[PDB]
Structures are given as structure tokens and as C-alpha cells.
């Protein structure tokens, strides 16, 4: 496991142990988006505006149809536990596509009920309706409370132009979502107490189940996470400060987050997770396997830590650690017990660890801070694993090796001659 | 490469009848679920829907302008689609195109591929 | 979806036995595991037993060796035999179905109440 | 060309041959955006709000002017076929800048007509006008149908506040576009039957032709693609599944798309293309030259295929291929003719290819599927080209080589001493 | 310093010397955003809509609170110049976090005044108020001029629905900003003569000072740059054209921008800067240290320039330089004094430099241009530093070296045996 | 832009000859190729001939050796000599200009009709 | 914030001397440098002198060796002694505080006017 | 791991009194600035606020529904929070939860952590 | 480095005349198409436009406030711009700035570079 104390001596600071919650299961609910609003048949107003709006919808529902059809074509008995799902189609489908296809076979039993509700949704003037399966008609609330009043108040031709503007606004917001798809977008259009669980729920991708090109309807499966806290799992953030080697600034280029699961130690790719104050909520395990030298470094064999040169000011030169300061006092003006007493670190030491046992007040570049009395902050280190991050640099040093290798081969040829 | 080839168009007397055919090389098509249908174009106008058929179920669909006048049929073993036109009228003169496309093929935006079209001229 | 319908709940004397049954209908060829969940009053759901399509079976620590789970695939039924009913075992029991795509489906819940003895 | 059958044996799955259409020519049309709306001179309402709106416009039209001026300064007889375009200016201009500059010399003959229409657009109250060259006045439809009615209905001071809000909304949507520029954005502001040809047209970049800082006007050249289908051109998607080497998971890191043009075989960077159901529509040829080892691998010399370690679950472990399954049955529970009969692949085999001649029902991790009877799915392989993707890993292994190289040189020195 | 003349001979074109301005100091202003609008207490309308809106606000103000709380916890006498700032907390804080924490200690003296104004802001119906510290109430202008008129005109129940829609629009725009934070976003919601200085001011990040979960208020510190022009500082853009080596296209992969500060020569990462017509405005010094071979190359030792193969058409094949053309005339049809006279460059020359002393009219691929009479445009070059950009390519060539190294070791073993 | 104006269309007897002409005006120093395009009734446009500013010339397979294209640069004219007119050659013929930046400009079209013979 | 209040401006005869003073209050433990700025009529602000919390001090080229800056930390005062007042030195003088986080604070400005002599 | 454990709930006669206690393992909590408070839930309703106390300042806060009936107190050395209920009424029957959370803890969305709750039944 | 240097300002009697000049080091300017012009500022007000001239065409532009009173001129060989003011009025007292900038230089936001300004005081 992580040896946090030794890693400080190479400027590697491991902090903020947070737990992890994974959405190992999902509860599914269905949403029917009915994109054409209903205008009262008594007046026939807005027909031309709906015709133009329909022409815009084709530019996003037809691409959705093509994608869903491609998923349905992966699989050409069923309805029995442990039965066969279907026949493999002629083509190629990766595991991601097979899972998507299998999910649609599971949703098939719902589609036969949704196809009944669609007949009721057609003639209905309601904006939101539930039969559970929820159905929404795009602009229908605005039509009921703005356009239908207008047709009496202002006459048919003036009110049609008001509908056209509303429909074109709705098309612009539809394009942002459908032009995977997260619940956050759908919830934005149509408007447990942990805020972070709510935020994570909107992060989950919705699954398209049907795209009806006749009635301009999209059926979506909404997935609600069931969150389970994994035991013996800790995610740490790690920061590296500059490390002095003969008056040149180096640092250990470790990944931004690391993870432990008992004896396993690896990185964490939390880019898809929601970071709460005390835990990460992730759709799946973010762990990945580290380079052998990085894993060995983190396990406390700090001689193995890879090091690279500091190219910019993004790398911090100092940090607070456990009530004291860990800093590169060559490039940072470390000061002890008053702004005049500079702490000098010898050229062969990489970072200075300053504790309350040595300084009551520590000044970093003039900033005076008191050390913490309850702080728990506590040899020759040679870091041979010099590393370059930039492909040009690696290529340049590879050319030097090849040049030296050709020279080595020549000595063999001449030496073989005298032999 | 999906290719569609129409045949059977020509000049015809009003009240007469004509039977169009379309041969389809659907083996290259990326799906097995699709409609086939017929469209017509006047030289200054958009392509009107004329008929469509579900290639698997055989359900036929027509616009109200032509209901009961024209009938669409298929033969899956021939890879052929047919449109028999009866009680022809002068307004029926147009280039007729067969298409393979997305259900319901009620509008030309839904087609995957288009034939070259055949001229039908109806004369009094 | 999958529809689950429990039966066999009721009152029972402690130390006795009860046999819960749950019928499933739907795209059951997509269901990875069937089993049973527990909630005691005022607390979260807990696993009791689950069985895979292959018959591989697992149990909660309280269930280990104490309960048995079984299925009949030709009629899509799931059964849990309760035996040596302890006073703590009174709870609402839900049958569940878990899909290969991680969807979870729940029954309505049926209540087992154990007498104070 | 691609040897799809052999590549399956290294877990490389080549699928979905799609054609390519390129916009080799463009038809140009001109659009004048007149950013200041006209308020009826009878009332002088809105003058103060327009002044504030003008001050906001400077923050985006002055940067446009500076960029356009920079393009016009590349070139300081003409109007004859094969004549000189102009004199090279004192400066530096890359081939991209020369093309932009030459395009402006071509547009010069249009500017002398646009400068006439600008005089009519000034006093006109019309929102869209054509003289073809199209001209649009920013909020003018709203001004005609909302603000001018208001000035009678509610008086001058109340209606000014309504104009100010409208202008600020228009500024926000102008900033998203102008703060290259695609036609999709312009079409969003101002509201053939193949949908994918329409989507590609909106993908094309507009060209700015004039920025008038006196009348607050932008002139744009809209380019309409002429699409031509290239013969003998096929674009394939390729997916790599995990490959077993002594119980460790490897894969071939091939590019996401590959392309053939007769004998030429290379990659395709379709990131700018529109993927239709049967073809890709691209502004220019997406092809790029592959590494010699990747081209040889794809040509069927599968011994040459580079291989790298599987670091995450993104790499699929199994796929459907031509009616059967290609999978790594070490980490995947492959099953034949019933969930109890596990398929065992030997440790020296990388992937298992399961066909209908061997299994009627194939189970992947419990998921049972029937094999396809009409499926067309059909030696010691040593993959020596081990490859690392991460610069740290390359640097670490380069240090080991250099360390071994210094040791080699020492043996030469002592051997030369005894000789 | 840069030797622009020699670098032309390797296709490296250094142009457009622009100065640099850095915001070395900032002037601070305070902005209080009060997110709940006030409705006239005489009617109690809109209470239910405000309750729902408040539930939405928690999804963005509570995450803001947690981040601000984390910053305040870094530091647990003060108010004297050169005094102690505070006590180091138990934890880890990087130099960036310490600077944020110190900034909050400086703002403490303002918070005791802002907490007085908050009592006046509560009951006030004004949308914008100043006491300087500016306070804004989210929808209050719309509420005053629309909802309050409505409550008489249409009744309490009809106007509540209008408030709900307005609040939900405001929440959507709040989420884009708060869901670092730039002044551009805040200025967008609530609506010196150099335009580029104004654009740079909006680029600066605002600092959150308080998040009041009782009154739903965010206090922000706005930072106004003080710009100072650095002397002896020049930023150059550099472009590389194709270079011929034995009929294969190579180029020098230099960084997009380079910088000089007297004798110092390095790169510039201007991605955060505003490029004006004559200077770059940057928040901090963009310079970074170049590879020794790149720095030596730019200093005029062009033998050291690293070279890489041209993989795509993005690399220009020709450019205008100082009144003439620098081009790869192998792949470009260079022509002199008429479209029929092709300029031939020998196979051992990388680029052809064509000046007014040799051609009056120069044709590039048929495009005829006159050379400039006032243009100032003016040996065996061996570029040994071959470089690969792609990790696969580096890894493949590293394996060949290791294979050659193992062969060398074998010769040592056998030669040691006979010795 | 470039303005293109054709002349020389009309009726012609099969086996005969006709000489189309097209005048161009505009920033013709930016035009890469001038030439002629064909559409037969009911089908897409097809290339006939094109000539570069250098005089390099190309032809469609039907035109190869059968037709000739020429220019006069001092008066910005483009000419196509039709000879051995076959019955299939009846079509609308457009002159075109192509810019170095890939812009294409079209004439109004002039119709050649060939008698049935 | 930091509040700065100057004193000691007024009229003075050339060749004489004057002693400006500025009082600071606020979170002065966050202040890196205190000092003085100058604007002559019609031109930008210019630095005169600054002093760090450590007493490290710097001067403009016109001030070098001619002026002296000092502080008293227990009472948060900043002083600039003007001596050998030249005719060009008439200006508005601002005291300033600069934070470690690059924030800058200004006084109200106090005017020094030097007689024509 | 922050854990809160309530105690003291039970059945009580109307007009009587009861004293709830909450023990808190706050050493693991990521902040030192927080409120602690009490919430109640009827089985069909959202958790109502009942009381909150500033852990550092000792300022107590109450909703108007209960002002003067209930009092909240703390003991920082015990890491304990108390709610003494006087003049109990039938409407007071609920599950009562102690929480540690963000100021002002006026609403349940602000809590960091929740206790398991204790049933209080008030009977005539 | 583009530098502008004004001269000629001073005190003048009402009804009198004054001639301003501006010398410009335009060789460093990034464009060859630009206007030059004159602006004036009262100490409490924004810079008003006064005159502008096209450096290539010589077209002059003026606001209506001063039409016929002031005239702008240039000499390209001197790199100089001139503004002769006649029939001066008390309202004309301002600091006057020459600028090089974007056409039409009708407003100060368009300037690339500014001179230091020269004070003109008009007195009865
Ligand atoms: C660190 O690792 C190296 C090689 O893996 C080993 O030789 C050395 O003994 C290790 N050090 C410790 C303290 O484990
Ligand atoms: C594969 O490539 C290598 C190197 O080019 C060659 O030695 C080998 O013979 C090739 N194999 C085949 C089957 O062509
Ligand atoms: C260029 O660099 C190499 C290596 O540093 C050196 O040998 C050579 O002399 C240099 N050339 C010049 C002109 O300085």
C-alpha cells in the first residue's frame, strides 16, 4: 500500500482519502417525446409553420433512426430464463454493440405497451401525461396558454407567426441534445437528499428505444442508478512538488489520482465520476494498472520513482503537509522563526521538510504562517529513472543511443579482424 | 451498390391502365427492414408520395389523392415492386420513381436510394 | 421489462418454515440472476439469495446453509425455502430480476412476520 | 489490400466498407448581415439603446476587421485568363494565407455590386431582401411586429426597454458565432433530398468578405458543395479485441479507420466528415500514410502487427463476426451448445474463432445466441513488435537499453586491453 | 537570438514580431449576486414557484459552498504589516491552494462590510444597487415590469406560471457559469479605448468570496488587470514548410510561437493570451524552455534542427517571404517569368528561395504573382536529427536497437571465449 | 465572380459540325480552368472538355480525339468545336470557370439539338 | 481590502524637503510591498519607491539615492522623505499596498506643488 | 467515517417531556465549521427541520412551529447534541434524526451525514 | 513602434486661428490602409471625433459640429497630418489628439495608436 511518509521526501504528496460508490444496477423508466404539438382543429391555424418545423425535425430524427436501426440489426427460446436471445447477424459487432443490442431485446416487452399509449397521445392536448410511462408534447403548454388565446384575440394570421418562433426555438434546443445523450439535457428542456446523488443521476446516459418517423416521436429509456459503496476502496489525489538535483528542478510525474482495493494499487480515471465532499460516485470502476516503476515508487521504494524536468510554473515549489511545510528551498526562500533567518538546504537534498519541532513561524517568499502544534508531520536518495515526456526528446536521445551502438559494432569488426 | 431500375412507362389514353415495375439489387442494402415505394414529380414541383409497401409484412399505403386508383404489390423472390395504375387521368402525368427507404416512406426525405424514373404521359 | 409477482407470505411461528414463490414474465432470456431481497423495518434493502441461469447460487452471510433457492425454467418460477425461522427474519421480501445490462426489476414485496414465541 | 480473414486471427476485425464523396468544387453565394435595425424616424425611440448595442458590436466586428485586413495585406494583368494576380507584399504568408488572399481577389468583382445594394439596405425596413445577394437586418422582424406597435400602445419610454432586451439577446448569439465560422451557426440565427447532404452543407466554413465599421455590416461568401463520388475508394472501420499471450491481454493498436484507393492503403481521419448510412462525405481526402509495420500487418503479414498491453475495459474481449464469434476465451467464458460446456482455448492461442460448424448455440458470459447458418466465417503466430503507447514507458525502456549499452562498451575496453 | 535568414534555408519562417503586455497587478471590486427575486408581499403570488426554484439552486450553490469551504480550511499578528497570516491546517495544500487561502484572508476585511449591505438588499426591490459594492437581484427587473403588472391585469394564478418560466430560464444560464469562472459569463447574464484590453478583462477569473445558503447569495471578487508592457520581449510566430530530402517530404517540427527576452530564447504558450494587432496580452509569462536542439537550431546552427516526415497536407509546401517565395519545388510546380519556364531544384537541395533578382513573375501551381522590388529577401545542409512524433514509431525503432544490442552482446560472449 | 455568356447553339444535322463560343469577364487571373459541361435530358451534368491557363487540355472519353477546345486570352473567349455530331450528343451545353480556390461558375446554357437523320 | 490615507502634501519651495506619510489598515499581514506612485499632469502613473515587509527597498531611477522610504510596523505607517526637491517633482503622489496575490490598493492622492523659484 | 447515533426515543404521554441525545464521531469530518441539528419525518412527508445549533458559537435556531417548546444544546467535550422536548403534542410523533451539516441546516439538503433516527410516539 | 507627436497647441483669442500638426512614425504599422484623424477631450467627457482623412485617397470627414470651421490635410512625404482651426470658439478648448486607425475613424474605439495630445485654450 501507499507509503505516504517516505513519498514526501521526493515531493510526492498523497492526500484526501475518499471512498467510492458505483452504480452497479439501474432501474429503468420510459419517456416518450412527442415533438409535434396539437393546435385546435377548429381553426387550422399554424399548419404551414408545423410543416416547416417537420422539415427541420427530419435533420435530427432520421440520423437517430439510422443509429437505432444499426443497433437492432446486430441480433436477428426467448421469454424463458436461460433461453437463447437470438441469431447472430451477418456483420461485425463489438461487445459494446452486443450489449446495446441485448438491451433493446429486453425493452421489446415495453414497446408493445408504449405503442398503445401513442394512440392516446396523438389527439390529446396535454403537455405532460402518464399512463409508469411519461409522455411530453414539445411546445404544448405554450400553445395552450399563448397561441390558442391569440387566435380569438388577434386572428389566425398574426398568431401563426408566434408559433413559428416558438417551434424554431425548440428546434435549436433539440439540436444541442440530439445533434451519448445524458438525462441532464432532457431534463433541461422539459423542466434521498444528497445533491451529489442527484447530480450523478443526470450524468447517466439515456437509451433510445424507438424513433417514429410517422408521428415524430422518440422513445427513451431513463436509467436510475442504485449506488453501492465499495468496501476497502480508497481514492487519493496526489500532487508532486519540485525536487532539487544539482540546482535543477525535477519532479515525479505521477498520475493525478491513485486507488487502493486491498493489496491492489493503481490509478483512477475519475473524469466521469462526481466528486462529493467525502466520496466519488462513478458509473464503473475507474482503476487502471500503473507502470511497474510507478507502483513500486508509491509502495515506498522511492529510488524507483521516475523523474522529469520542470518546464513551467504549474508545478508547485512548496506545500503545506501535516501542519508543516515541504518545499524546494533552493528556488523558494524558506525562512525560519522570522523573515531574516533563511533555511538553507544543501545541494544534494531534494526537498526540505519543516516541522513544528524546528520552526514556530515559517515564511514562504515572505508569507508568514504559524506551524501547527498538533501536526503529525515527521538519507541519500538517487533517482536513476530519468524520463522525458515529449516524443521529440525521446527521439533525440534514441538517436544518440543508435549512434553509440553503431560505434560499438565497429569495434567488434576491427577486433574480430585482429582475433 | 443498390440499384433500382424502373420500366413500363409510356404514353397512355385517359381511362386506360398501366403497370410499372421496379427491379432492385437489395443484397447490398445495409438493413433487412425497409419499405419500398413510388413517387412522382411534375417538372416544377416536389416529389409527391404515390404508394409504399412494407417489404416484410406486405402492408400497402397510399395518399388520399389516389386511394383505390393505384395498387402496389411486391414479389420478394423476384426482388420486384409493382404499381398498377387504373382509371388514369390527365393529372397523373409525371416522372415516376421507385425508392427503397425508411418506414413509412411517406415522404422523399426517407428514401435510401432512388431509381432513374420513368415518364408516364396521360393524354385525352 | 420483466414483471415479478410474489406469493407465499403470511404469518408463521418461530422455528418453523415457509416457502416463498415468485413468477416472472418478460424477456427472461436477458435475465442474468433471479433472487430475493430483504428490508427490515427502517433500514435499507439487503440481499438474501440469488441464482444464475446456470444455477450458480450465492447467499448472504445470514443465509449461508440456512436457506435454499431454486427455479423452474419451463414455467419461469423462483422459489425460496425459509427454514429455522429466527425472530429477526420478519421483513418484507422482494423477488428481483437482474439483466445482463445491469437493469434491476422488483416485485411488489410480500411480508413475512414471525411470532414473538 | 486488406486481408480481412487473416486479421481475425490477431483479433483485428475490419468491417463496414463505405464509399466516399468529396466536395471538389463549390458554388458561391453572398450574404450581407446588417447588424443595426431601423426604428421609425417619426418617433426617435430606441436611439440610446442602439448606441449601447453599437458599443457592444465593436467588441466583435473590430477583431473581424483586423483579421480580414490581415488577409487582404498578403497581395498588394489581372482580369485576363492566365494573368498576374498581384504583387507579393513584404511579410510572410503560408499557403493557407495565400489561398485566403486569392479568394478575396476573386470576390473583388462582387464587392462593387454589394456596395450599391448597401445604399438601399440602409433606409429599408425589410428583414430579408434580395437584389442573387441576400441581405438580413438583425432584429428587424421583431422591431416591425413588436416595438413599432408598442410605441402607440404604450409610449416611447416603455418600449425602449423592450428593444434593449432584444438587442442584448442578439448580441449573445452573435458572440457565439463570431467571438472558422460554419454556415450552421448563421442559419441558426436567421432561421436534393438526402439529409446527409444538407448536414454537410452546413458543415462548410463561410468566408468573410467585408466588415464595414461605419454601417456595422458583415459580408459573407457562402459555399455550396458539389459532391462527387470517388471511384475505387472504400473506408473501413477496424476494431481490435483482446489477444491472449501467456495469460496476459494484448491488442493491436490500429487506427480507427483505414482507407483503400486501388493499391494504396492508409488511414482515414474522418473527424471532419459526415457519416451517412452508406458513404462518408468529406471536405477533402482524409487519408494519411501508415507506419510500414501497420500497412504490412493490414496487408496480411500478421507477424508484423504491433501489439500493446490492455490497460482498461475499453478494449472489447469478444465480437460477433460473420455469423459466429471471435473472442478471447481465457478471460471470457465462451460456451458451446449449452451453458455447461466451456470452450477452452490453449494458452498459446490468442483468440478463439467459433463458427456454426462447431457450435449451434454460443454463449458469451451466459448470453446465449444462435449461430447463423448463412455465416461466411471461416498456425503459430509470433508477434515480436511489442510497442508502448506511453512516453514514460518508452523512456523507462530506453534507459535500460542505454544502461546495457554502457556495459557493452566496457567489455570492449577490457577486451581491447588484453588484445 | 533568432537567425531568421538562415532558418529560411530549412523551411522555417519566423515572422510577425509582437510585443507582450502582462497583468502584473489587479484592482479588486466586489459583486453580490442575490439569486431570489422579491415579489410584493401584498399578494403572496409566486411563492410556490420560488420554492421550486430554490430546490434547483441547491444543485449549484451547495457544490460552490463545499469548494469555498475547502479553501477556507487551509489556514486556521494579522492586521500588522509583516505579521503572521495564520496557522497551517492539518492537511495538504499546494501552492495554488495556499494562494487562494491567503486571498480569502485579505478579503476578510471586506466581508464585515458586505454583511451589512446584505440586510438592505433583502427587502429591496431594486435590480441593481451600489453601496463600491454592486448587488444584483436575479430576475428583479423582469418581475417589476412584467409580473407585478400582471397580478392586477390577469390575477395571481395566471401570473405565477409566467414567473416559473422566467426563473427556470435564469437557472439554465446560472448552470452554464457555476455548474474556473470568468467575468465574461457574469457580464453575459446581467448585461481606455482598446477593445483588446476590454476582451482581456473579461478573460480574468472571478474569485468566490462567500456562498450564503440561507439567503441564496454568491459574493464574487472581480479582478481588473493593470497591464504593463514588458521591455525587450518579442513573440514570433513560426511556420515550417516542407523540406526535400531525396524526393521525400520532411519538415522541422518547431513550436507554434517563440519568445525572446534579451539573450533568453524560448517558446510561448499564448493559448490563454489575447492576440491584439500589435501585442499579446497575457495573464502571466507564457515562456517555456525549449529542447537544446530546438534552441540551437533557432540560434542559426541549422545543422541541429530536428526533422520529421510530412504525414498530411496541413504542412504548407510554399510561402511568401520578404517579397519572394520559399518553396519545395519538387512537389510544387515553381515557375519563373512565365507559366512555361519551370524552376528545377536539384535533388540534394531542400527548398528553393526565389527573389526579385531572379524572377520578375513567379508562378505557384499556375498562380502568377509579381515579386516585390523592395523585398529584402536574400551550402550543403545535413540534418542528422531524425525524429518521430508518434509513440508507435519510437517504440518500433527502439525494438530494432534492442535487437541489435543483443546481437552485439553475443559477439562479446564468443570473443571472450576465444580470448 | 465570373460572368459567362455562351453563343453558337441551335439546330444542326447529324454528321455535321458546330462551334460553341463563351465569353468570360471578371477576375479571370484567378481562374484555373475553363471548359464545357453537358447534361442530357433527365441526367446529371457531365464534363466535355477543359483547358488550363497553360493550355494543358483534357477531354471526356466521348470527346477524346473527336472534339477540340481552345481559348483567346486577350479577349477572354472560350471555344469548343463540335465535329462528327452523333445522335446522342443533343444536350444543353454549359461553359464553366473553375477558380484556384475550387469555386465553380456556370453559364446560362445553350442547347444543341441533332436531327434524327 | 486595505485602506490608505496620505498626509503631508502642500506647497513647498524648490531645493527644500517634505515628508509624506500614509497610514494603512486592514489585513496588512497579506501585504507584500508598501510604497509610493507618481503621476505628473497628463501622463501615466510612475513608481517612486517601495519597501518590502523585510525592508528590502527599491527606487525609480529619478529617486535613486535622492529619496528615502521607511515604515513603522507597530502602527502601520509608510513614510517618504522628499529632499532636494526639483521643479519637475510636482505631482500627485499616491501610496499603495501590493498583496502577495497581486492585488493593488491606492490612496486618495496628495498633491506636491513646487514653486517656480 | 462519521457516525451519528440517536437515543432516548419512546412512547410518552401528551404534555410530558422527553430528552433525545446524539453521539457524533466527528473526528473524521472534513471540516471544523458545521452545524448540528434535528429533523423529523412523518411516514408520508419530507423531513421537517426541528432545531439546529452552531457547534462553535452555540447559537440555536428553531422553526416557528416549535419555538419555545423544544431546546437544543451541545457538549463539545462529549461530542454530543441534545434536544429536550416539553409540552409534547400528538402532532410530534415522528422519526427524529440528528444531522451534521452546512449552515444553517434549515433544510435536509444541507446535511453531510444522517443518524438512523429514533421513533417518538406521543399518545393521549 | 508607432509614435505620434502633436505640436502647435496653445492659447488663442476667440475668433482666431490655430494650426495643429502631427508627425507619425508609421513605418512600423502593420497595414498600409488606414485613416488618420483628430480627436478632442474635455476633462470630464469622452473623446469627441474632430476630423479624419484617408491616408491614400485624401477624402476628408468631419462631424456636423465643426463643418466648415476646421480642415484636415496631409503630406505623405512628410508623414504629417494637419488640422487648421478657424473661427475658434470658447467651446473648442480641449486636449487634441492625433490618431492612426481603422476607417472611418469616426469614433475613438477605431484608433490603433494615439498621440500624447496638445492643450488648446480658447479665451474671449
Ligand atoms: C527497490 O527496487 C529494486 C528493484 O526492484 C530493488 O533492487 C531494491 O532492493 C528495492 N528497494 C527496497 C527498499 O525494496
Ligand atoms: C513479413 O514481413 C517480413 C519483413 O518484411 C518478411 O521477412 C516476411 O517474409 C513477410 N511475410 C510474408 C508472408 O510475406
Ligand atoms: C552546431 O552544434 C554542434 C554541436 O553542438 C557543434 O559541433 C557545431 O560546431 C555547431 N555549429 C556552429 C556553427 O556553431
Author numbering:
A (entry chain A), D (entry chain C), E (entry chain B): 19 to 94, 107 to 161, 168 to 215, 225 to 236, 250 to 436, 441 to 481
B (entry chain D): 1 to 124
C (entry chain G), F (entry chain I), G (entry chain H): 1 to 9, 11 to 30, 35 to 59, 63 to 72, 74 to 109, 113 to 129
H (entry chain E), I (entry chain F): 1 to 9, 11 to 31, 34 to 59, 62 to 72, 74 to 111, 111A, 112A, 112 to 128
Show me the paper's own sentences about this structure.
Like other paramyxoviruses, RV3 mediates fusion through a coordinated mechanism requiring two membrane-anchored glycoproteins on the viral surface: the hemagglutinin-neuraminidase protein (HN) and the trimeric fusion glycoprotein (F). HN is responsible for receptor engagement, which triggers F to undergo structural rearrangements that result in membrane fusion. The prefusion conformation of F (preF) is a metastable structure composed of a globular head region connected to a helical stalk formed by heptad repeat B (HRB) and a transmembrane domain that extends into the viral membrane. We then determined high-resolution cryo-EM structures of potently neutralizing VHHs with non-overlapping epitopes complexed with RV3 preF to investigate the molecular basis for epitope recognition and neutralization.
